[PDB]
C-alpha cells in the first residue's frame, strides 16, 4: 500500500552506532557534513536500511508522478501530515535527514539514480544541495540539514525532482521531534494517472470557537460536568477505520480557556483508544506545550516543547514509557483493551496539542484555533 501509518519501538542499543547517529545526524550539532556522513558511511555500508529502524512512527502517502517534459523531470510533491506544531521562532532548529530512494532495478540502467529534494516554505525554500549530502549509494541519497522548527509544519511542501520514474521511488523526511522520538514523513511515488493517496491522518481543532470556553456558561449543555466526569467524547477514527477506535475529549478546552470555577479533578482525559486487544505495534502519544514558568511580560516569548510517550503490550497488558517534563501520561483505561491520555487540569492552559499515532491512524489534536 502506498499509504498508511506504522509504529515500532526504537532501541538505540540494538542499532549500529545509533547512539552516534542520533547525536550527529538527527541533532543539530556540527555545521559540516563531516561528522554525520562519517558515522553513516560506516553503518550504512553494512546494513543499507539501518536508518529505517530509527523511525518511531512512519506516515507514508502515495503521490503521483508529475512530468515536466521540457526539462525531462519526474516530480513528486506532497504535503507531509506533520503530526504536531513545528514550533515557535524563539525555538532552535531541528536537524532533519532527507532520504530519496527507489527499488534497485534488475539490469543496471544507463542513467544513474539522481534526486533533488527541497522543503519549500513561504519565504525561504530549503534545498538539499551536494553540500548537504551525508551519504550516497546506487539507489539512495541521504541529506542532512537544520531547519528552524517552526518552518517544519503545515505549509512546508516537500518536492523531489527525478529525471526518471524509478519504480518504488520515495522521499522520506526523518523529523526528530524529541531526543527520543523521530517521525518519518514519506512520499511514495504512484502512477501519474493516480489520485494522491493520503494516510488516515487528521487534524482537529478541539477548541474551535475558543470564545465558547471563556466561562462555564455552556458546561451543562456541552456535556462537561462533574456528573459526566468532564468527558464529552467524540470519535476520531472514521467508520471504516482500523479496529482500534480513538476518541477525543472537548472538555479540556474549558480547563484551558475558562476563567470560571471548574470541577476539581486530579486528571482530565484528553483522549482514549480502544482495540488494544488486537493491536500488535506500539502506540505513540505526543504533546506540544509551553513552559510559561520564569516569564517576563515585557519579553514574554516562550519555547514550544514536545514529549512523546509510548504504550506497549507485554503479556496482554499495556504499559507506558515517559519523558521528563511531560504534561501527559498514558494509562490503562476501563479494561486492558483501552488506554487513556491523562493530563492535569492546570496544565491545560499551556497545552498546545496532543497527537495519536498508531497502526493506520494519526490524529493531531490542537487546543488553539478553528481549523
Amino acid at each position: 500500500h502506498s499509504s498508511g501509518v506504522s509504529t515500532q519501538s526504537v532501541d538505540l542499543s540494538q542499532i549500529k552506532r545509533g547512539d552516534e547517529i542520533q547525536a550527529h545526524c538527527l541533532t543539530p550539532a556540527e555545521t559540516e557534513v563531516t561528522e554525520c556522513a562519517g558515522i553513516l558511511k560506516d553503518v550504512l555500508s553494512k546494513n543499507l536500511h539501518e536508518l529505517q529502524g530509527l523511525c518511531n512512527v512512519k506516515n507514508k502517502m502515495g503521490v503521483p508522478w508529475v512530468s515536466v517534459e521540457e526539462l525531462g523531470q519526474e516530480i513528486i510533491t506532497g504535503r507531509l501530515p506533520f503530526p504536531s506544531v513545528g514550533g515557535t521562532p524563539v525555538n532552535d532548529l531541528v536537524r532533519v535527514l532527507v532520504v530519496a530512494e527507489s527499488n534497485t532495478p534488475e539490469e543496471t540502467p544507463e542513467e544513474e539514480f539522481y534526486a533533488y529534494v527541497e522543503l519549500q516554505t513561504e519565504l525561504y525554500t530549503f534545498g538539499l544541495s551536494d553540500d548537504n549530502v551525508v551519504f550516497t549509494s546506487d539507489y539512495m541519497t541521504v541529506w542532512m540539514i537544520d531547519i528552524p522548527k517552526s518552518y517544519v509544519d503545515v505549509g512546508m511542501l516537500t518536492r523531489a525532482t527525478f529525471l526518471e520514474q524509478w519504480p518504488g521511488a520515495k522521499v522520506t523526511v526523518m523529523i526528530p521531534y524529541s531526543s527520543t522520538f523521530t517521525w518519518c514523513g514519506e512520499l511514495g511515488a504512484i502512477s501519474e494517472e493516480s489520485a494522491p493517496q493520503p494516510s488516515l491522518s487528521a487534524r482537529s481543532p478541539v477548541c474551535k470557537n475558543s470564545a465558547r470556553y471563556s466561562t462555564s456558561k455552556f458546561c451543562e449543555v456541552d456535556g462537561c460536568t462533574a456528573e459526566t466526569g468532564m468527558e464529552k467524547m467524540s470519535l476520531l477514527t472514521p467508520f471504516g477505520g482500523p479496529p482500534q477506535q480513538a476518541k477525543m475529549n472537548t472538555c479540556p478546552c474549558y480547563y484551558k480557556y475558562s476563567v470560571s470555577p471548574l470541577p476539581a479533578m486530579d486528571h482530565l482525559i484528553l483522549a482514549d483508544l480502544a482495540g488494544l486487544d488486537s493491536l500488535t505495534s506500539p502506540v505513540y502519544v505526543m504533546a506540544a506545550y509551553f513552559d510559561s514558568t520564569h516569564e517576563n511580560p515585557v519579553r514574554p516569548s516562550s519555547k514550544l516543547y514536545h514529549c512523546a510517550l509510548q504504550m506497549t503490550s507485554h503479556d496482554g497488558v499495556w504499559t507506558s514509557t515517559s519523558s521528563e517534563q511531560c504534561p501527559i501520561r498514558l494509562v490503562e483505561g476501563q479494561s486492558q483493551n483501552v488506554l487513556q491520555v491523562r493530563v492535569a487540569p492546570t496544565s491545560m492552559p499551556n497545552l498546545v496539542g496532543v497527537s495519536l499515532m498508531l497502526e493506520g491512524q494519526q490524529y493531531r489534536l490542537e487546543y488553539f484555533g478553528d481549523h
Binding site: 466561562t215 462555564s216 456558561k217 462533574a226 480547563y255 480557556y257 475558562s258 476563567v259 470560571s260 470555577p261 471548574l262 470541577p263 476539581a264 487540569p345 492546570t346 491545560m348 492552559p349
Partner: protein, 66 residues
C-alpha cells in the same frame, strides 16, 4: 463537588455587573464574582480593581442591610 479556578480573568469587571462574590482558597486562591445574570468569573484577590469592587460591594451590601 468542589470547584476550583484554573485561570483568572484578565479583564476588569464593572461593579455594576456583579451580584455577589466569594473567596475560595485553593492552590490558586481567588475572588469568584457572580455577574447579575449568573456567570462566574475568577479574579485576582490582590488586584486593585478587584479589591475596589469587593469593598464597594461590602459597602453596598451593608447600608442595604438594615
Amino acid at each position: 463537588d468542589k470547584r476550583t479556578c484554573v485561570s483568572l480573568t484578565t479583564q476588569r469587571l464593572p461593579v455594576s455587573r456583579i451580584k455577589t462574590y466569594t473567596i475560595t482558597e485553593g492552590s490558586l486562591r481567588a475572588v469568584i464574582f457572580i455577574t447579575k445574570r449568573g456567570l462566574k468569573v475568577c479574579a485576582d484577590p490582590q488586584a486593585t480593581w478587584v479589591r475596589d469592587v469587593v469593598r464597594s460591594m461590602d459597602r453596598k451590601s451593608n447600608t442595604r442591610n438594615n
